[PDB]
RNA sequence: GGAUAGUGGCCUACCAUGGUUUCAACGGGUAACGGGGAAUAAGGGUUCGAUUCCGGAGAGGGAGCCUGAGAAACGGCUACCACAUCCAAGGAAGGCAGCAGGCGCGCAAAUUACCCAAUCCUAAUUCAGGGAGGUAGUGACAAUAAAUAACGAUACAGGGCCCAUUCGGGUCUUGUAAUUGGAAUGAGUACAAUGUAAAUACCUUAACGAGGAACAAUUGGAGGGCAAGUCUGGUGCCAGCAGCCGCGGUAAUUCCAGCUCCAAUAGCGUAUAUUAAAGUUGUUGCAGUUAAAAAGCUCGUAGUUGAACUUUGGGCCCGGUUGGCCG
């Protein structure tokens, strides 16, 4: 009988079985439990804003040997502390400290990308000026 | 070019039926310039706040200012 | 509040972007039919897929059904009017099997080049975008016109265009002025 | 730890090579024709793999 | 019986333990206003619907009311509560989840303009009033069309046929120049008129009006996935790239940079969701010996399913079809 019922009056049982077994999938479970709305530190948002706190020199994971040199950001909407990656070559001196920084995700649905452990969000613009523009020197951040 | 055109039997009917803005645009009539929408609405607000003709109120205000 | 006004898409990006065969074939067809961009083949494939799906869901229904007869007759009438298919074939095999190349080798951009009044598909495109060509009474400035033989019956040049007369033109006028100054 | 410095080291030591003067490419209806010519009239490398962008030998 | 415009535990007086419930009551959550509908479509489906129309609720939270045919009405009133304004210190004055605008908030969203002329509404309903509505402005959410100059005459990356004075040349040059230049075009201004409440969001006869330092176009990549460079300089497990596998430790095709190529063309890149992918939710249509998974075994209520049989059977005629043994 292939397990599951095969009767013309088993719609209730099939619907209930599917409803109970749908909880085994991570996406459906998280969506219906609202973990991204509450447990996630972005508040269920694509982008967030925060204040840079300090510099973090966490090392890479094997096989690799490099320093990613991320920053510490305290978000504004909820006040949670996070570690935010600074992507480009020489954007640390632009995103140094005490700036209204805008943060985005990595691209792994809330996981670390590569050799960077414990980080999930990256800096894409700082103090109204994009990190990409700062890197390409198209426009420079004001000192004030 | 393509447009609309209407011929009346007489100038009297043309004036009676044609819109006022159209008559002003053609030159067959002119509308006297008045205050703008905000200004006339504010005038209506002031004289709706004022009850009565207002002459007696103005006289009383002037008398109170004098004394 | 304002009543809604509908809009629709007209092109479909293909499911996989990098095919050394599909990209190469679409590049051949665009180059040999004078197509400045790739979204144009995308939209022509969108229309081809629409008409093919209409033919398929028409054919999936049993024979002699009046809805099938009416829809097939209307589709055949439109396709004969545009003219991509011979007007003495009612087997519907050609309209279902119509390919992008066959569809494109009938639109007016290939027609002008094959008739030779432009000598180049790119030259024809520049002429159209510069408005110095009128398919019929009204002067056209769009490359994608898909004449329905009305413009073929009414083939001519634009009145305010070269070889149409009544206007030397700005560059011609200044050339004449310079020649007059040089002569005296 | 201790490496919270030398940010963009190669970015700083990279020599600033300027942009070379070059005629502007024609984009629009022209670019497809230029690629048509560059692809279908070029038959130089068709021996074993039909290369399209050969490096300078 | 009362009350209601009347039905009714709607509210009062008097009986039973009556009503709902594993076919899920009740309770909790909803990052829930419900629909037409929105995104892929072989099918079956999975998400979304605050928002252009319908219905409902509210117009700071609650309540209670007058007028009125119709309001629990808030651009009506009364009173209390998160607020808040005006004193020569008694008192008075509300309420933009309506237009515009500001503050706070946040990744996130427009001018404190003009008109009642295209549409309709109200009034004594006909000459008035409508931030309803329409016009303009901002900002490229979407969506359709689509510029960045073709080309005459000769110098080659080496191309077809003849005179066969045989690898010297000719009715067309597949395609390149810092040589000469043959009809041409929009944007920005507009002796000028057209769209509108004469004015700029559509055209043209205009006059200024491309000649490639010109009216100049980029986003990321070139190891694979996935088409696209072992070309040069710099750094040297550092700085960095990297959706994943991985590159870089002195010849790095992967980092930064100069020539070439791609998604696309004013549109592309990134982030977060969601759909196909996903026959990794499986009704269609998944697996359970060893990859995760058969309850330790049995009984049993709900639930699902549940031998076979009853007029199975024949004769004639005809309103109606068949590319028909028929043109």
From Swiss-Prot, chain A:
Coiled coil: none
GO MF annotation: an example: structural constituent of ribosome
Other comment: Present with 10600 molecules/cell in log phase SD medium.
Function: Component of the ribosome, a large ribonucleoprotein complex responsible for the synthesis of proteins in the cell. The small ribosomal subunit (SSU) binds messenger RNAs (mRNAs) and translates the encoded message by selecting cognate aminoacyl-transfer RNA (tRNA) molecules. The large subunit (LSU) contains the ribosomal catalytic site termed the peptidyl transferase center (PTC), which catalyzes the formation of peptide bonds, thereby polymerizing the amino acids delivered by tRNAs into a polypeptide chain.
NCBIfam families referenced in this protein's UniProt entry, alphabetically: PRK04211.1 (NF003254), uS12_E_A (TIGR00982)
Subunit structure, as described in the record: Component of the small ribosomal subunit (SSU). Mature yeast ribosomes consist of a small (40S) and a large (60S) subunit. The 40S small subunit contains 1 molecule of ribosomal RNA (18S rRNA) and 33 different proteins (encoded by 57 genes). The large 60S subunit contains 3 rRNA molecules (25S, 5.8S and 5S rRNA) and 46 different proteins (encoded by 81 genes).
Name by which UniProt lists this protein: Small ribosomal subunit protein uS12A
Gene this chain is encoded by: RPS23A
From Swiss-Prot, chain B:
Organism domain of life: Eukaryota
Functional description taken from the UniProt entry: Component of the ribosome, a large ribonucleoprotein complex responsible for the synthesis of proteins in the cell. The small ribosomal subunit (SSU) binds messenger RNAs (mRNAs) and translates the encoded message by selecting cognate aminoacyl-transfer RNA (tRNA) molecules. The large subunit (LSU) contains the ribosomal catalytic site termed the peptidyl transferase center (PTC), which catalyzes the formation of peptide bonds, thereby polymerizing the amino acids delivered by tRNAs into a polypeptide chain.
Full-sequence portion shown in this chain: 69 to 135 of 135
UniProt feature, compositional bias: Basic residues: 37-47, 56-67
Subcellular location: Cytoplasm
Region (Disordered): 34-67
Name the UniProt record assigns to this protein: Small ribosomal subunit protein eS24A
Entry PTM: N-terminally acetylated by acetyltransferase NatA. Also partially acetylated by NatC.
Family label: Belongs to the eukaryotic ribosomal protein eS24 family.
Residues annotated as transmembrane: none
Organism placement in taxonomy: Eukaryota, Fungi, Dikarya, Ascomycota, Saccharomycotina
Gene name per UniProt: RPS24A
Assembly mode: Component of the small ribosomal subunit (SSU). Mature yeast ribosomes consist of a small (40S) and a large (60S) subunit. The 40S small subunit contains 1 molecule of ribosomal RNA (18S rRNA) and 33 different proteins (encoded by 57 genes). The large 60S subunit contains 3 rRNA molecules (25S, 5.8S and 5S rRNA) and 46 different proteins (encoded by 81 genes).
UniProtKB/Swiss-Prot annotation, chain C:
Cross-link (Glycyl lysine isopeptide (Lys-Gly) (interchain with G-Cter in ubiquitin)): 179
Domain of life: Eukaryota
Disordered: annotated segments: 159-184
UniProt KW keywords: Cytoplasm, Isopeptide bond, Nucleus, Phosphoprotein, Ribonucleoprotein, Ribosomal protein, Ribosome biogenesis, RNA-binding, rRNA processing, rRNA-binding, Ubl conjugation
Chain segments annotated as coiled-coil in the UniProt record: none
Domain S4 RNA-binding: 106-180
Cellular localization per UniProt: Cytoplasm; Nucleus, Nucleolus
Biological process terms in GO annotation: maturation of SSU-rRNA from tricistronic rRNA transcript (SSU-rRNA, 5.8S rRNA, LSU-rRNA); ribosomal small subunit biogenesis; translation
InterPro entries per UniProt: Ribosomal_uS4, Ribosomal_uS4_CS, Ribosomal_uS4_euk/arc, Ribosomal_uS4_N, S4_RNA-bd, S4_RNA-bd_sf
Listed GO MF terms: rRNA binding; structural constituent of ribosome
Modified residues (Phosphoserine): 183
An example Gene Ontology CC term for this record: 90S preribosome
SUPFAM superfamilies xref list: Alpha-L RNA-binding motif
Cited Pfam families: Ribosomal_S4 (PF00163), S4 (PF01479)
Other facts noted in the record for this chain: Present with 106000 molecules/cell in log phase SD medium.
NCBIfam families: PRK04051.1, uS4_arch
Function description: Component of the ribosome, a large ribonucleoprotein complex responsible for the synthesis of proteins in the cell. The small ribosomal subunit (SSU) binds messenger RNAs (mRNAs) and translates the encoded message by selecting cognate aminoacyl-transfer RNA (tRNA) molecules. The large subunit (LSU) contains the ribosomal catalytic site termed the peptidyl transferase center (PTC), which catalyzes the formation of peptide bonds, thereby polymerizing the amino acids delivered by tRNAs into a polypeptide chain.
PANTHER family: 30S 40S RIBOSOMAL PROTEIN, 40S RIBOSOMAL PROTEIN S9
UniProtKB/Swiss-Prot annotation, chain D:
Stretches for region Disordered: 1-31
UniProt modified residues of type Phosphoserine: 12
Modification sites for Phosphothreonine: 44
Main location (coarse class): cytoplasm
Keyword Phosphoprotein: yes
GO biological process: cytoplasmic translation
Alphabetic keyword roster: Cytoplasm, Phosphoprotein, Ribonucleoprotein, Ribosomal protein
GO MF terms, alphabetically ordered: structural constituent of ribosome
Subcellular location(s) per record: Cytoplasm
Entry's Gene Ontology cellular component terms: cytoplasmic stress granule; cytosol; cytosolic small ribosomal subunit
Disulfide pattern: none
Similarity comment text for this entry: Belongs to the eukaryotic ribosomal protein eS30 family.
Miscellaneous section: Present with 37600 molecules/cell in log phase SD medium. There are 2 genes for eS30 in yeast.
Record's function text: Component of the ribosome, a large ribonucleoprotein complex responsible for the synthesis of proteins in the cell. The small ribosomal subunit (SSU) binds messenger RNAs (mRNAs) and translates the encoded message by selecting cognate aminoacyl-transfer RNA (tRNA) molecules. The large subunit (LSU) contains the ribosomal catalytic site termed the peptidyl transferase center (PTC), which catalyzes the formation of peptide bonds, thereby polymerizing the amino acids delivered by tRNAs into a polypeptide chain.
Quaternary structure, from the entry: Component of the small ribosomal subunit (SSU). Mature yeast ribosomes consist of a small (40S) and a large (60S) subunit. The 40S small subunit contains 1 molecule of ribosomal RNA (18S rRNA) and 33 different proteins (encoded by 57 genes). The large 60S subunit contains 3 rRNA molecules (25S, 5.8S and 5S rRNA) and 46 different proteins (encoded by 81 genes).
